[PDB]
Symmetry: D2
């Protein structure tokens, strides 16, 4: 099943979450294990070299391992056995030192953490890259006006940059979150059969620290075979990412509507938003995958069956799904086409009624807040009845045209003059984005 | 990613949901389309032959199509284009008739329905097979007694057959559900660009009916590009199946617990080389059933979440279905597979079940005694006298059978032969055998 | 918490799923139990009368029961205890016959089924009512043309009735599904402590059948304390309903868009018209999926009675019923009173200036000239209608080959949406037809 | 519907998430708004006093408001209207200043945030309290041995304290998480009709800052009417808490099994018909919350300046999650501080596999005493026999020439003693408790 894979997953991410990557992660653990126990005096340095030479994914047969797993219950034991048979060919007496003192889940979880680290690194890169380009766009259109849409109904003006800044804001907060969880997530899983590490006796802590250092991972306060919050948390932040990008994709698709035509996805490297589809798809698929991870948390005792198995393919799907949305969001963010003219046109589709408020405040002071209220509802009721722009109806209004010149009315009914804090929001958002950098 | 695929998916099911299977479904649609339109006078019979010759999945390159899809937004257009370029090599003037009057989703949904039918067929087979073997085991152990477990606490007796009968019951109801949705699910998706089928003019219905008949699919009251209840219902029943097998998997894992050791998955004393009994007899099969019952709910909610698809064709929500439905089918196929293995080969330890039964030293049978001593003496007096014997059987900790034998009023009302029977689990099985009877009965009724 | 309850739940449904409704369901079970065991010779007819008199929800204190439940672990034991203390006041020696031979879950599940039966009845009523009005609207607008929208882009013409017929189709299928599960869902839950019903000895089946008949419920092949598929199936179909009405609510909100303004929910103070009704439908379609998966998630219940997973069902199923009842309610309001602007629909139709109708002309000029020549000639006309931006009708009129093959009267028809509605009217017909067939 | 509410929700949490609490949250916003705008010169101080006097939830009719909402589409407009009619009775000319320049969602989101802050405060107190008592229990049983259970199968020894330390570890990580999201979650929602705040002109930022300060909330970089990640994140951590307490609840129920009988829930004020009613709540929450959480994730792609339907879906969902978790924390505390341990039964269960679960501990020692190659064979032989002629491994090894010739009766007694194969058990408890004390500050 790879037909839709190019469209839904980012190639680099798929490489990490492939059989090769999964296998390599565990093998990395095994080699690192031998290395760490050797420096503790548990394994002959001659064996360390033998093991490392066999810890290359390429040397194993996935098809064969797959059938064995179906009988083993996990991936570690069939791999360790296959690793042993490879080390036997060359240094037969080294075979007895592989996977010493460790349990299957140690290899599996640590291997996974290694893959998660490479994954984290990609996601942070793409995020920063996307935030940068989004930052520029926000500034570029910090003041090009478009109508505000509330419950899909026209509302007071807004700016395109204001909208893009909101997405920027969320992305910054996610980079922040990924940064805070990093020291929590990147930990070693080394507990042995029941997490007591008893098999290593007094060389337990020494081997553990050596092992963590070897893999450049932190040593946790204790093993976590059945405490899975670290993994679920990571998945949850990726969930937040899919959701925000989902909002972005929705907004694009609505802006690309025939009856709106204000913003468009870049033209193929009827104009269908094939990129937005990916973003919306991810924001629709991920919640379910995420609840699965939450659902599997109440893992029994020292190792749970079934609940633990449910994590295996779920976490990787989430990472892939999100990698694909980030990739697609980058494409549209750096190349979307804007039609400011059309934005202007759509703005007085309600014929200035959306700007009634801007006029109400001015005539509030020019005359009585009490009198202006009446006089304004009257002009709107008319601009609708005899259907014609509010600018005109107001020009033919004695009290109004007697208090406001033709030049004043032209300004009041100009959306570019009712942008509120639009530019400020973009400023603060872009500001914070640059602050984070450091 | 195929490491865990042999363990989590049934090989036959993966074949259906592979690139080849996906492609073939759509090509089958294309060939059938030409055929149906030819008989309506829209396509020269010479083209029909050209097209069918190119409607073979093997002739296409997945890798290439994959990259094209990333730009197209769907799978139909890149496939149709590739199909056209293949038909051009031989009969160049046949190229203009492929995919005539149809929209991308028509090919995709119909292709899917074809895959779903092959899937439905596997699932029904496996279910029937599993129900059969489960039916025999139920009968075989209709009266082997085991303690009842409530909130994981010991309760009045139950029978192993009774337990297996409940799984049988659920499975029968699912077979029933699968049967009722069949006519609803296996429908054709032919509506064109906006579901009006206007491009075919007055040849619309004729082509439609011909097409349905060609594929052996029913013609729906109308196209359903954005009315997805049919697919969500199918996923939902599969969900129910995952759930039921999940309960079965849980029960096995709990019965295989070291402190229970009453039922075991196949493969020697527990699992594999039963050397050091303590561990190793791991329930690798139950893990699959439990895994599926844990994963499926989320995948199912995704299909529910993607139902409010806008207008004539929705973007994003529709894309979300593509890989989700297949995952559900594969997950369930793997659970059915594993459930079959353990159902037909589980090991029972009736002696250990007996031993576990009086772990509470007959206190779990207090009720069975309470009713008899209710009539022999006063329901009011018996109540007092019984709580007294239990409080003692616990204090001086020793079986209730004993405490009652040393009880004047009790031993004066019930002989030693009577008390032996009252404190025997085998005599307090209630409707255990009846339940197994009714369930198996209904299972045989369904058959027809 | 009742602020949003009037807006999100249908009052009749909330009545069913209230403390009173929950309590009454269990009490109904107890009364029916005594009645059935009496006719088996297990209970004196004098006690049956005493029990029935106490089986009225009104006579109990919810607040008090609630605190007891926090210690009991379920609702049946504190209720049965309170019931016993009420029967004591009058007929003291009747107290020992209440809840005889039954376990807490028997009372709880059966009580629930009773509530689900009332709920099923409301949902079937509302659905049929909604299907009817939707049916008329479908026919009424069977041929008022509106542009087709694909990926939110303009596509070949469609009819408003066509759209509404789709929703009708789905609702018909749900009524059908609700009909098929009815015999499966409305079953009695009577198994006792461990589902063996051993406490009743040989009077087990007799009491069981009498009890099922008393409550007008079917007796299942065996008790189902930990086989929950019946409940999850029902929630699943309600899920299907929320999803369908969700699609409807989405379509309305999109048609109510300022840049569309084609359909509206029933009604300064001008351009301000928010779809408060569609909000409910979309909300339900968004909330229900999660609630449903919870029911699926709770299926692997251990042995004879599961703790935790079973507790998870208690408030979840009722939430689903209430959520859906509110969506049905709101969908009915908008279905029978939505405002249509056929004029605006026409206007929006040539927003692409006839390019959306290029296909309709392509087939005709396919025969008039060469399918090969027509193709070229048509792309040329579209490319121009875009460049010098002006309707395609015009560009085709200034096209020698085209105006030489098609009269001005012929081009006026080809570029008219009303003439490219395909099977629109047929779809509405089949859907409405099937709706009338079901009725019986 | 309050039957199961006492059992599933913590009373204090329900108070926060009640009609009264919801209403008061928005009223607090209204009062604070007037106050902030007055100091910017937009409202007469005499009106500020009139408004504040009307911003008390008690003065309004929920039933009435509920029917109005059914027509309004939200809760803010019917409340603001009702508030206005109350301020009219006394200071009629003050009515025109209420809710000035604000949109419905500003009142609603800010009101909710206020409620979430009170909720956050409860959850942090309970977590700290639960961590403390779990901390003592961990230490108290840091070395009482119980058998390890892998895939529900007996495995090498473990300690009760070790197990409890794992729950402690998770709880500490959650407190840490709650601390990190606090500055992110507690922000003001003030953007007006479309988030431009245009209606206030150049008095926008001044009023905004004054408003934030008034409510003791941070001012975000920009309004967030359709960027909901802050709320979903909070719900997500609460999800993590439900999950962890869910694992704890599961372990208790399994330890309370008749065939185990090692740990029991307090005998809150029959075979030993002791049902784990508390564990039921923890497991239930862990089962219900995932669904509620995905709902909030599902509602994130909210369109433009204000989304209909998806935003409505948040309203009752976030509160349910908070209540559900408050009920699980409550129940977890009860069992944590009062669970009964049967160390003797744990010992008995330990050699249910008759020492085979300790085979590994013997394997390493006999690996050196003799040949790692010879010991291997000799050990599998003793196990295969201890099983066949079914009798303890301690015995089978004592009748083994090579073994009894290499290890004294005193040495074998020790090797087959669980208390001597606890590995890092006590260390894990140490590190976890240590980190718990570290966090404190």
């Amino acid at each position: 099943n790879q037909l839709f894979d190019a469209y839904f997953t980012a190639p680099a991410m798929r490489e990490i979450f492939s059989d090769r990557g999964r296998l390599q992660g565990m093998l990395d653990f095994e080699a690192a294990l031998a290395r760490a126990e050797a420096s503790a005096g548990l394994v002959p340095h001659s064996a360390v070299a033998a093991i490392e030479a066999a810890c290359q994914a390429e040397r194993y047969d996935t098809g064969a391992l797959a059938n064995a797993i179906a009988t083993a219950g996990n991936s570690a034991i069939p791999l360790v056995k296959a690793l042993g048979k490879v080390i036997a060919t060359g240094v037969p007496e080294a075979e007895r030192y592989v996977h010493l003192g460790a349990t299957s889940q140690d290899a599996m979880d640590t291997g996974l953490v290694l893959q998660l680290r490479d994954a984290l690194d990609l996601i942070e890169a793409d995020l920063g890259k996307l935030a940068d380009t989004l930052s520029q766009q926000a500034l570029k259109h910090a003041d090009t006006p478009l109508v505000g849409r509330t419950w899909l109904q026209h509302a007071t003006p807004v700016t395109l940059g204001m909208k893009l800044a909101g997405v920027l804001g969320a992305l910054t907060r996610h980079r922040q979150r990924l940064q805070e969880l990093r020291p929590r997530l990147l930990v070693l899983q080394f507990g042995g059969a029941s997490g007591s590490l008893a098999a290593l006796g007094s060389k337990a802590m020494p081997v553990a620290e050596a092992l963590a250092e070897q893999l450049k991972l932190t040593l946790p306060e204790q093993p976590w075979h059945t405490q899975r919050d670290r993994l679920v948390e990571f998945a949850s932040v990726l969930g937040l990412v899919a959701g925000s990008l989902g909002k972005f994709g929705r907004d694009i698709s609505l802006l690309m509507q025939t009856e709106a035509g204000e913003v468009f996805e870049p033209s193929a490297p009827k104009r269908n938003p094939v990129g937005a589809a990916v973003l919306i798809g991810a924001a629709t698929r991920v919640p379910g995958l995420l609840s699965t991870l939450f659902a599997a948390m109440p893992q029994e005792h020292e190792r749970s069956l079934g609940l633990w198995h449910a994590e295996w393919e779920t976490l990787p799907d989430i990472c892939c799904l999100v990698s694909g949305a980030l990739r697609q969001a980058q494409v549209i963010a750096e190349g979307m086409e804007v039609d400011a003219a059309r934005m202007r046109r759509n703005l007085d589709l309600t014929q200035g009624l959306v700007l009634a408020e801007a006029v109400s405040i001015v005539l509030a002071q020019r005359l009585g807040r009490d009198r202006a209220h009446h006089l304004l509802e009257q002009c709107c009721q008319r601009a609708v009845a005899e259907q014609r722009h509010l600018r005109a109806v107001l020009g033919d209004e004695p009290q109004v045209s007697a208090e406001l010149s033709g030049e004043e009315l032209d300004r009041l009914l100009d959306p570019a003059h009712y942008l509120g804090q639009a530019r400020v929001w973009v400023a603060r958002a872009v500001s914070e984005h640059q602050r984070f950098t450091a």
